[PDB]
Nucleic acid binder design. Structure first.
Ligand SMILES: Nc1ccn([C@H]2CC[C@@H](COP(=O)(O)OP(=O)(O)OP(=O)(O)O)O2)c(=O)n1
Ligand SMILES: [Mg+2]
Ligand SMILES: [Mg+2]
Ligand SMILES: [Mg+2]
Ligand SMILES: [Mg+2]
Ligand SMILES: [Mg+2]
Length: 539
DNA sequence: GACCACGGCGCC
DNA sequence: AGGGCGCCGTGGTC
């Protein structure tokens, strides 16, 4: 390319180099642009950022985030990564995408700009005639990138003092548990080491080993194994409690307070748009899609996610979302009839599990029923079902049998989906998002069957993901107009922040947008709460 | 200081 | 031998 002075003309493709992967934390080391057979390198990258009207190119959203951090409105546009990800969601990295579609991902901005341009040309060619994938690009993924950039740059407020205090408290309880474990083992060892614990439990204390690990075939110490040994030796209960607390402390209580950004005073995640096989988003650095919620100890951590002063959080969660999608995709008249009748499958299963009326089911019980319902749907074994329900193996089988006999069109939809996957090499969502699943004709049964479970899950999880994305795209402009913010997405949930004076209206509107995004054969239902913190906003 | 593989486990 | 993720500490290694 011809070297030309900065700035580039409008419409140019950008290349950029960051000091680290997180745009909210990165130094912008270099910036360049390419168009029309020319490359333009910025003498000073931060100054030069002001000259761009759009971020067009590889990882455009990341540059947009850094621009927003600096007070600039630089929306992301075309990004070859999104085209590639739609063609095949195994396309998750710029290294891999460049090699597959025509170049090399280097560490120089001018080269990255030129690469972006040529990758765009080639990948745009590949999507010609792929009308459904093009619709996803234009109506979902490209506009969504701008939404994600605003979410990332906005961040969420954290009660740091509350978590710092919690660390001190949890440490004392951890020490009580470890001391007891070491007393019972008769010696000290590294309780965080699963290899050392294995030896202590199964060789020294002579407890029965129940299961093996996946890759290395050691005797497992996982919670399901420990649960089955709780009455076999008092050490087991202590270990379970120790793991609960150390998990909370090491993963959430200690790390999160140290990640407050010095300028925003908030915590900033990354919402990765080309990271999953199904079309879901993921969140990283830190992951805010797995903040604890199940146990009362984990719940305390959610209290730390708070609204700005004078604002409230608004939490919206699609009800029974994948079950509704399955009713639409399969066309099962009976499953559709459940949602037309306003019933709740999770509550119904919980009533059975715990042996109480529907009205006696509490939130803890209902949540427990979710793993069972989704587990069974996507191929859980009778053995495992019998294990985490503490019931005979026989009535676990029968429960699985009763499940599929109630909704006949589901088995048929599974069989069609799998034959299509074998024939075409991919399965697809309602909107035509694809996942290639090559091991569907593997001759090793366990491998083949695992591939089948991946394959028929994807249209369901992926259609739910497509719906949530479309809802975000539609909702975002409306929030902006009301002076509200979108903070987090957690797969089938959104967390917004609204001024107190507007929070009730924002909740009503966001519910409506989410319910009406793309009607199915069954209504979509959304539960919405408002509160000072994330725990209170979901109650 | 890092990379990776693993087991383990937090959420959806 | 439920599906999708990312992060922990350990262990091995460079
Ligand atoms: N153990 C789980 C939990 C969740 N999911 C997937 C399927 C539903 C989706 C969203 O999770 P939830 O909101 O917790 O499930 P829900 O059915 O929408 O329940 P709720 O009515 O409480 O929102 O995630 C899953 O595959 N396995
Ligand atoms: Mg407040
Ligand atoms: Mg839900
Ligand atoms: Mg949810
Ligand atoms: Mg390091
Ligand atoms: Mg490596």
């Amino acid at each position: 390319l011809e070297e030309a002075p900065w700035p580039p003309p409008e419409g140019a493709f950008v290349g950029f180099v960051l000091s680290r992967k997180e745009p909210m934390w990165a130094d912008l080391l270099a910036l360049a642009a390419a168009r029309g057979g020319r490359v333009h390198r910025a003498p000073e990258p931060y100054k030069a950022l002001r000259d761009l009207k759009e971020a067009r190119g590889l990882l455009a959203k990341d540059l947009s985030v850094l621009a927003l951090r600096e007070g600039l409105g630089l929306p992301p546009g075309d990004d070859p990564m999104l085209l590639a990800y739609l063609l095949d969601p195994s396309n998750t990295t710029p290294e891999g995408v460049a090699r597959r579609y025509g170049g090399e991902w280097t560490e120089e901005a001018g080269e990255r700009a030129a690469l972006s341009e040529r990758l765009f040309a080639n990948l745009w060619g590949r999507l010609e005639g792929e009308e459904r994938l093009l619709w996803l690009y234009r109506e979902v993924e490209r506009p969504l990138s701008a939404v994600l950039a605003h979410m990332e740059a906005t961040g969420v407020r954290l009660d740091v003092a509350y978590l710092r205090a919690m660390s001190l408290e949890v440490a004392e309880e951890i020490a009580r548990l470890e001391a007891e474990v070491f007393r019972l083992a008769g010696h000290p060892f590294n309780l965080n080491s699963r290899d050392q614990l294995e030896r202590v439990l199964f060789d020294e204390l002579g407890l029965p080993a129940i299961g093996k690990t996946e890759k290395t075939g050691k005797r497992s110490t996982r919670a399901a194994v420990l649960e089955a040994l709780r009455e076999a030796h008092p050490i087991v209960e202590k270990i379970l409690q120790y793991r609960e607390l150390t998990k909370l402390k090491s993963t959430y209580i200690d790390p999160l307070p140290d990640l407050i950004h010095p300028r925003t005073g908030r915590l900033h995640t990354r919402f990765n748009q080309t990271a999953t096989a199904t079309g879901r988003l993921s969140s990283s650095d830190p992951n805010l899609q797995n903040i604890p919620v199940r146990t009362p100890l984990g719940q305390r951590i959610r209290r730390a996610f708070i609204a700005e002063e004078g604002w409230l959080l608004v939490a919206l969660d699609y009800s029974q979302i994948e079950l509704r999608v399955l009713a639409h995709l399969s066309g099962d008249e009976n499953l559709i009839r459940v949602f037309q009748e306003g019933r709740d499958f999770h509550t119904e299963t919980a009533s059975w599990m715990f042996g109480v009326p529907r009205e006696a089911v509490d939130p803890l019980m209902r949540r427990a029923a979710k793993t069972i319902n989704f587990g069974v749907l996507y191929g859980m074994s009778a053995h495992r079902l019998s294990q985490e329900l503490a019931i005979p193996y026989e009535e676990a089988q029968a429960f699985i049998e009763r499940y599929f006999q109630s909704f006949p069109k589901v088995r048929a939809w599974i069989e069609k989906t799998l034959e299509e996957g074998r024939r075409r090499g991919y399965v697809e969502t309602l909107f035509g998002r694809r996942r290639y699943v090559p091991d569907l004709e593997a001759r090793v049964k366990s491998v083949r069957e695992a591939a089948e479970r991946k394959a028929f899950n994807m249209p369901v999880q992926g259609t739910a993901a497509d719906l949530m994305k479309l809802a975000m795209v539609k909702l975002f402009p409306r929030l902006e107009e009301m002076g509200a913010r979108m903070l987090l997405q957690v797969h089938d949930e959104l967390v917004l922040e609204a001024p107190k004076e507007r929070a009730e209206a924002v909740a009503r509107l966001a519910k409506e947008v989410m319910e009406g995004v793309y009607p199915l054969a069954v209504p979509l239902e959304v539960e919405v709460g408002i509160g000072e913190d994330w725990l209170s906003a979901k109650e």
